Amino acid sequence: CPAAVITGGARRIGHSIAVRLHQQGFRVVVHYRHSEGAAQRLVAELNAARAGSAVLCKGDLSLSSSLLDCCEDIIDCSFRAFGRCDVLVNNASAYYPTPLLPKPIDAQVAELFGSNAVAPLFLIRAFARRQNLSVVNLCDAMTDLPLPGFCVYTMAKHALGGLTRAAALELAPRHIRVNAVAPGLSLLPPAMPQETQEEYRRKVPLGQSEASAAQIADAIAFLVSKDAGYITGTTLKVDGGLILARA
Amino acid sequence: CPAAVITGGARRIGHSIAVRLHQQGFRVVVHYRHSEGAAQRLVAELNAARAGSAVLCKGDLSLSSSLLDCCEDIIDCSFRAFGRCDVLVNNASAYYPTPLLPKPIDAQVAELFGSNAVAPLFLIRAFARRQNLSVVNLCDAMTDLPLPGFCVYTMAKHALGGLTRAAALELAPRHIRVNAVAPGLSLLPPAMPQETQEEYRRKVPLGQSEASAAQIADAIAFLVSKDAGYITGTTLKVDGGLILARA
Amino acid sequence: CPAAVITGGARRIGHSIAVRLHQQGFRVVVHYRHSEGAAQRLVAELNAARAGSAVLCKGDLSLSSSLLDCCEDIIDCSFRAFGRCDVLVNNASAYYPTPLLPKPIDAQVAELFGSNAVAPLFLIRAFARRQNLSVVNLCDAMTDLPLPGFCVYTMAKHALGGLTRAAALELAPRHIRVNAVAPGLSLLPPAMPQETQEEYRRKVPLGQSEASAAQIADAIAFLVSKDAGYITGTTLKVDGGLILARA
Amino acid sequence: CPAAVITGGARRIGHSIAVRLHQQGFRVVVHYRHSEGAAQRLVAELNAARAGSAVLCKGDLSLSSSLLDCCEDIIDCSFRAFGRCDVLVNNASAYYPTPLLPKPIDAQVAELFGSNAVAPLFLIRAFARRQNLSVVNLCDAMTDLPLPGFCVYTMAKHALGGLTRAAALELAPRHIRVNAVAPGLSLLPPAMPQETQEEYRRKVPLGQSEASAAQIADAIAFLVSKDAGYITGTTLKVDGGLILARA
Ligand SMILES: NC(=O)C1=CN([C@@H]2O[C@H](COP(=O)(O)OP(=O)(O)OC[C@H]3O[C@@H](n4cnc5c(N)ncnc54)[C@H](OP(=O)(O)O)[C@@H]3O)[C@@H](O)[C@H]2O)C=CC1
Ligand SMILES: NC(=O)C1=CN([C@@H]2O[C@H](COP(=O)(O)OP(=O)(O)OC[C@H]3O[C@@H](n4cnc5c(N)ncnc54)[C@H](OP(=O)(O)O)[C@@H]3O)[C@@H](O)[C@H]2O)C=CC1
Ligand SMILES: NC(=O)C1=CN([C@@H]2O[C@H](COP(=O)(O)OP(=O)(O)OC[C@H]3O[C@@H](n4cnc5c(N)ncnc54)[C@H](OP(=O)(O)O)[C@@H]3O)[C@@H](O)[C@H]2O)C=CC1
Ligand SMILES: NC(=O)C1=CN([C@@H]2O[C@H](COP(=O)(O)OP(=O)(O)OC[C@H]3O[C@@H](n4cnc5c(N)ncnc54)[C@H](OP(=O)(O)O)[C@@H]3O)[C@@H](O)[C@H]2O)C=CC1
Ligand SMILES: CN(Cc1cnc2nc(N)nc(N)c2n1)c1ccc(C(=O)N[C@@H](CCC(=O)O)C(=O)O)cc1
Ligand SMILES: CN(Cc1cnc2nc(N)nc(N)c2n1)c1ccc(C(=O)N[C@@H](CCC(=O)O)C(=O)O)cc1
Ligand SMILES: CN(Cc1cnc2nc(N)nc(N)c2n1)c1ccc(C(=O)N[C@@H](CCC(=O)O)C(=O)O)cc1
Ligand SMILES: CN(Cc1cnc2nc(N)nc(N)c2n1)c1ccc(C(=O)N[C@@H](CCC(=O)O)C(=O)O)cc1
Q1: What is the number of structural domains in chain D?
Q2: Domain membership of residue A240 as a residue range
Q3: Residues 6 or more apart from A182 whose CB is under 8 A from it?
């Protein structure tokens, strides 16, 4: 049985990824930072389906003196619990505005660049050094049309895109595939008022609806499968045509 | 049972795609131009497995006065035979050099632009007007790094990518998804000497091997499946990292 | 004194380019199809400032059995009149909708693909075989966000983008540079009502104004200058941040 | 008279840029880190040409508790010395390998990301808050074909690209243009043995030669000039077609 590590796999999309992989024979490591309770409910639920098929792992992925070691332990966790790690899904991501013109800015680049870019880099490094192996990074189809006010987040995601291709090429000799899935509009913020959410959905050309977590899980499932054995360094966009819409 | 049209489906990649879709309940129309024998052997072979599950259709897709009528009939064939058409795979493609510096150039653009770009347009146009509907175009991942001497072929493939995105947006309201699969190095020319073939394969970062028709068919099968129901206007690269390699 | 061919150079952007290059010592060949009067006035106005520094040349760039010969004569015209041709600006371009769902379609593809892609190809080809040489193609920055209903036009421009990169690479050894300028929103349709025009200008991030013909011509002048002597195969976007705006 | 800040402007490309801008009537703030000698010879040399036209400024741009204030002072330096800052050229850049498979990695990500992305972000942020204003970031045309072993540098530059577009959109209302120039093969490492250097030059399609520093300054001078008044959010590639070369 192959093992997979899902960062931020406690809720939403990450939760759907952890479940999907598990439904396919994967033993999963569910990482989280604060959604400890949601994490436990998922792990328990998975082990109830298959004893010893799911473990928990807590860790902050922000830039810090402890980030490099934290990433080392998160991967080490897969080996301690399952003796192996075949799949890494970089789903954990900090997301909020940081307007150029008027929490500290320094602390923002630390949390935004850490979770969306640097942690993934440290995780892949650790994953590759301890070795159907594949990595799947979660990108954002919309970063090409920068969301006003999310400057730092945009840079972070662009950097992650550079990591997907840079890693893809260096790990090819090691037979490790590195790809990405780029959602456009998926699960909306839970606090966001319905009328606002409805103004967002109406923008999606294909069905005027956001992508469900399961549809995103589907794409990831395809990329980790043997049906994508020749695919590496590619980004799979899942945005219902949203990026194609003219302003 | 859904029906699928596959242009240039008698041999190589088209053949593999036709077999893959058929194994999934699809009633396929095999289109061909010169490979009449191969087409008959494929249809017979397919019907043998399920009576009335395959039909044949001949037609040149080069630019001409007849192209528009020809593409209408090719789609009409699916309806006459199965009363429906749910999937269209634009696979047919002419491919040969057209060096800028020293068969008539006019006739070359007629054949290269017709099969790679204009017929697909007319086919999509007919497919949409006669309506899990989806179209899949066979692109080329290496066209961003122009193969010297294949200028016209390259322009055609770029037009095709343009069609993939324009059609995806115009057809979203009609619930028809339009995507593309972009091979990098797949089935090599049968007449190319083995040593030259070996020099080409050695360039592939992931395994130093070309993609098998089945690995290309896998990606395609994924894009027509319900697991891609939210995917439209995207190009799935299947090149084992080739496009990432620095000269 | 160097010579420059500007296709569709009788009015609008083409007109502005002919004047800029002329004010720089260039001897221009003003090509046109229907704008015979405008071409005569422009040529006279330029010869007035410098005798024998401008010539006229009529020719349809739609797909045809004559296209190839026409393109040969258009380049030959510059040699007949100036004994040389250093710069080719592919500005001529047909533009109008071709909706997938309901003038013959065949005639529309002949004109859109002819002027936007095939002619430029034959022109570049002729330009090269008869040789600071450089070619500048007029692309469209907004084609990445397909304008609903302009499907054929969009494909043509993508083909033109492919030609820019393919020609640049093939012609590097011949010391001929090949670049492109991609306007976003520039000279609006003269018949478009003011309010509609005002709605379009509002969409531009940088100044809520469209690009003036002179600003497009400035970019063109730079790429043909020696200050761009190491620049080939690149596309210079001049859209005032329009392509960055989210829908 | 306008003032321009040039990071890493003591030698090579940065030096060429400072001179060019100075030759156009610009008052320049020459920033450096260790090239203290070259910085002083450049500034005196420029002050000899025009008294009080050039000032010096030393600083490190790696991630740190002090980075934010260091960037603030570098911009402030322009106002103290000239009471204004119109142009900002982000040239400074750390460059070296960081192989995924076997100086600390944490330290490397701090210097590579700080100088190539984060510092630029704080400079732009400082430059905008204190306000023909434009920013020019130095990118890398080859980052799309990741150089094996430069994983971190590649991510840093990708992030720089996201910043160029993010900033360009957010600062359009403030009338500040943000663009980028992306060299391919320019000045080789001074310690690199000639034969290696020759092997690198041979790969350049246009002339088989690297871009001189002047050719790069030309592109930058153009983007800062009024001849690019409508250009923002764009990346100008200057690689002699190197990026088009198929491996
Ligand atoms: N949803 C959408 O519409 C879109 C999503 N995406 C991308 O898809 C992925 C999943 O998105 P979505 O489910 O909405 O994400 P969320 O923002 O809901 O969750 C991200 C998860 O990662 C965790 N996390 C955030 N910051 C850190 C940190 N510094 N260290 C460790 N963990 C952290 C969260 O905390 P905790 O574990 O405490 O709960 C959370 O569970 C992301 O990478 C996102 O960028 C892209 C486009 C659209
Ligand atoms: N093979 C590779 O390495 C790569 C392939 N691709 C793309 O994948 C797709 C499949 O490739 P591959 O199987 O090698 O293709 P082939 O070139 O082998 O076959 C194309 C097929 O389409 C048919 N065809 C060609 N011209 C015309 C025309 N004018 N009118 C009608 N039919 C025509 C052929 O004729 P007939 O039916 O008479 O035999 C042929 O069977 C193509 O779109 C190709 O561009 C992209 C990158 C790499
Ligand atoms: N204006 C804008 O807002 C934008 C323009 N662009 C691009 O910039 C370039 C210049 O644009 P613009 O000035 O508006 O273009 P126009 O559409 O006004 O003019 C194109 C010119 O080329 C000629 N032409 C059109 N079809 C043919 C043909 N089949 N054969 C010969 N000549 C033909 C015209 O005919 P005739 O000589 O008979 O008058 C016309 O003078 C174009 O390539 C356009 O695609 C891109 C984005 C935006
Ligand atoms: N040269 C080429 O072939 C290519 C260059 N480029 C890009 O063009 C730009 C200029 O390139 P090039 O002149 O070769 O660059 P160099 O690497 O020669 O110089 C970068 C400059 O910035 C300074 N610097 C380096 N690290 C730091 C740091 N951590 N903090 C502050 N300053 C630092 C240097 O130190 P000091 O002041 O001590 O001398 C140096 O003056 C760069 O952004 C580069 O990425 C892109 C492709 C190719
Ligand atoms: C598509 N998306 C949903 C969403 C949900 N969680 C995520 N989580 C992460 N990590 N990354 C994402 N891209 C992400 N995206 C979006 C896009 C824009 C805005 C946005 O404009 N937000 C404003 C609020 C807008 C309003 O309600 O008026 C803000 O101030 O944050 C919110 C969610
Ligand atoms: C990846 N590919 C295989 C291949 C085979 N059939 C195809 N068929 C079509 N429709 N489209 C393709 N892209 C295609 N590609 C290639 C790539 C380069 C050359 C090439 O350079 N060909 C030289 C021959 C090179 C040699 O053997 O010396 C030629 O003149 O045709 C051939 C096939
Ligand atoms: C940016 N642009 C200006 C412009 C004018 N002449 C050109 N000429 C050429 N050859 N190419 C262009 N891209 C071009 N574009 C545009 C963009 C959209 C529409 C457009 O949607 N037109 C509708 C009319 C919109 C309306 O007024 O309601 C049409 O049906 O033609 C027109 C001009
Ligand atoms: C194009 N380029 C020149 C060069 C010089 N200084 C720079 N400085 C910065 N800031 N950024 C750059 N991109 C840059 N590029 C390159 C590209 C690759 C290698 C490279 O492969 N370097 C090997 C040496 C290769 C060898 O000689 O064997 C190394 O280990 O450093 C060197 C220079």
Answers
A1: 1
A2: 1-247
A3: A138, A139, A140, A141, A235, A236, A237, A238, A239
